Amino acid sequence: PFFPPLYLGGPEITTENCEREPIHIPGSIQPHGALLTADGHSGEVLQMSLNAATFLGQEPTVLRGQTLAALLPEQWPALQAALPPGCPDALQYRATLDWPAHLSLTVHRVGELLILEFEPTELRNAMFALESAPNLRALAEVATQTVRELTGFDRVMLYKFAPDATGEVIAEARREGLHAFLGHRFPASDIPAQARALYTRHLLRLTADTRAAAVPLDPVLNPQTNAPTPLGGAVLRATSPMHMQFLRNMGVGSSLSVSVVVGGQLWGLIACHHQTPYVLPPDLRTTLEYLGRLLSLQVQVKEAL
Ligand SMILES: *C/C=C1/C(=C/c2[nH]c(/C=C3[NH+]=C(/C=C4\NC(=O)C(C=C)=C4C)C(C)=C\3CCC(=O)O)c(CCC(=O)O)c2C)NC(=O)[C@H]1C
C-alpha cells in the first residue's frame, strides 16, 4: 500500500520504496499557478495555496471562508451547472478571467470538492500527417516532430513501455547539439507502478521548474473529510522529489508528458524536456492533450499491422 504522505508522518521516499510514494496527495503545488479548493454546494473556499495572493490579490487567510459566488460572480453559475455532484473527475470547466494586468481557470470535481487552478495565459495538416504515416516508426517520428514544432521544447520523445514495464525512446525530435537518447532503454522503476497507474487515468503532467520548491496547500487536509485532497487531476500538483532530482541530474529544467493509451492500457508517453525552466502556455497544453488522444488511436491501428 501507499505510505502516508509527509504531513501525516510518512517517511521520505528512497530507491527502496519508490512505488509507495502517494504522488497523488502531495498537499502542495508548483509555484507558476495558484490552487483553491471549495465546497461543491456552498462554494466556500476550504483550502488555499500559500502563494494565492501572487495570482488572486488576497492572502490565504482572507480568501478562506469566502464563497465562489462572491469571488467569481460571473463564473459560479456556469461552474455549478458544468460540474454537478457525481460527474467524472477528469470532466473540466474552463474559463478565461480578466485580471488587472488573462488568467486561465480550470476546475474539476472530486466527490463533494471543487479544485480550482489558476495560471497566467496569453493543426489539420498535422493530424493528416499522423494519419498518413505508413508504419509505426514513421508515425512516431511525425508525432515527435509535430509536438516539437507546437511547443518549442528542446527534446520530444516517444517513450514506449515493454511488457516488463522497462521503457525505451523509440523516436525523438531534438534541438541541435543535444545527446541522442534514441534506442536507449531504462528500468521499470524510473516510472514506478503507482505513477503508471495514475497516468492511465490523468493523461498529462508536468514540472515547469525542476529546482522550484513546492508551495503548501493549507489547511492540508480537506475539512470535509479530514483526509488528504486528491490532486491527481490537477496539473499544478507538486511533482515527486525523486523524479525532480532525476530530471536535474539529466540537465532538464522543465518536463512534460502526455499518456499514449491503447486498449485501456498505458502504451507509452510523449515525453518532453527543456534545459531552462519553461511554462508551456495553457492553450498549447490543451492542443497537446488532443494530439495525445489522436496519436493513441493511430498507434492502435499501426501496431496491429
Ligand atoms: C525510486 C523512484 C524513482 C523515480 C520515481 C518517479 N518517476 C516519475 C515520473 C517520470 N519518470 C520519467 C522518466 C524518464 N524521463 C526521461 O526523459 C527518461 C529517459 C530519457 C526517463 C527514464 C518520466 C517521463 C516520468 C513522467 C513525468 C514527466 O514526464 O516529467 C514519478 C512520478 C512523477 C509525478 O508525476 O509526480 C516518480 C515518483 N524515478 C527514478 O529515476 C527513481 C529515482
- Please tell me the distance from the alpha carbon of residue 37 to that of residue 176, in angstroms, as a whole number: 43
Domain check: are 192 and 266 in the same one?
yes
CB 104 within 8 A of CB 121: yes
Identity of the residue numbered 154: D
Q: Is 303 helix (H, G, I), strand (E, B) or coil?
A: helix
Q: At what angle do helices 136-151 and 282-304 cross, to 10 degrees?
A: 180
Residue with cell 455532484: 85
Burial of 222 (0-12, 13-18, 19+ CB in 10 A): buried
Reference 238, options 261, 207, 265; nearest CA is 207
| Torsion-angle region of 16 (φ positive above 0: left; ψ -120 to 50: alpha; else: beta) | alpha
225 C-beta neighbours (distance < 10 Å), count? 11
Pocket residues: Cβ below 6 A from ligand 1: 15, 18, 21, 23, 167, 169, 181, 186, 189-192, 195, 205, 207, 239-240, 242-243, 246, 255-257, 269, 271
| Resolution stated for this PDB structure, in Å | 1.3
**Beta-strand relationship, 265-274 and 254-262:** antiparallel
Give the start-end residues of each E strand in the chain.
28-29, 34-39, 45-49, 93-97, 103-110, 113-120, 155-161, 167-174, 185-186, 204-207, 215-218, 221-222, 227-228, 254-262, 265-274
- Please tell me the distance from the alpha carbon of residue 261 to that of residue 46, in angstroms, as a whole number: 35
- Please tell me the distance from the alpha carbon of residue 242 to that of residue 254, in angstroms, as a whole number: 15
Q: Which residues contact 24 (CB under 8 A, 6 or more apart)?
A: 198, 230, 231, 232, 237
> Considering its fold, how many domains does the chain have in total?
2
Residue with cell 465562489: 68
Q: Which residues contact 297 (CB under 8 A, 6 or more apart)?
A: none
Domain that residue 133 falls in: 121-210+240-305
CB 129 within 8 A of CB 289: no
- Please tell me the distance from the alpha carbon of residue 244 to that of residue 185, in angstroms, as a whole number: 20
Ligand 1 centroid from CA 203, angstroms: 15
What is the chain's length?
Answer: 305
CB 182 within 8 A of CB 172: yes
CB 264 within 8 A of CB 200: yes
Domain check: are 177 and 228 in the same one?
no
Reference 275, options 183, 155, 187; nearest CA is 155
Q: Which atom of ligand 1 is nearest to the CA of 195?
A: 32
Q: Which three cell numbers stand for residue 171?
A: 523516436
CB 50 within 8 A of CB 234: no
Domain check: are 81 and 29 in the same one?
yes
CB 264 within 8 A of CB 297: no
Q: Residue 248's domain is classified under what CATH number?
A: 3.30.450.40
- Please, after which residues is the chain broken with C–N above 2.5 Å? 101, 122
Ligand 1 centroid from CA 42, angstroms: 38
Q: Residue 110's domain is classified under what CATH number?
A: 3.30.450.20
Domain check: are 42 and 9 in the same one?
yes
Ligand 1 centroid from CA 57, angstroms: 35
- Please tell me the distance from the alpha carbon of residue 101 to that of residue 128, in angstroms, as a whole number: 39
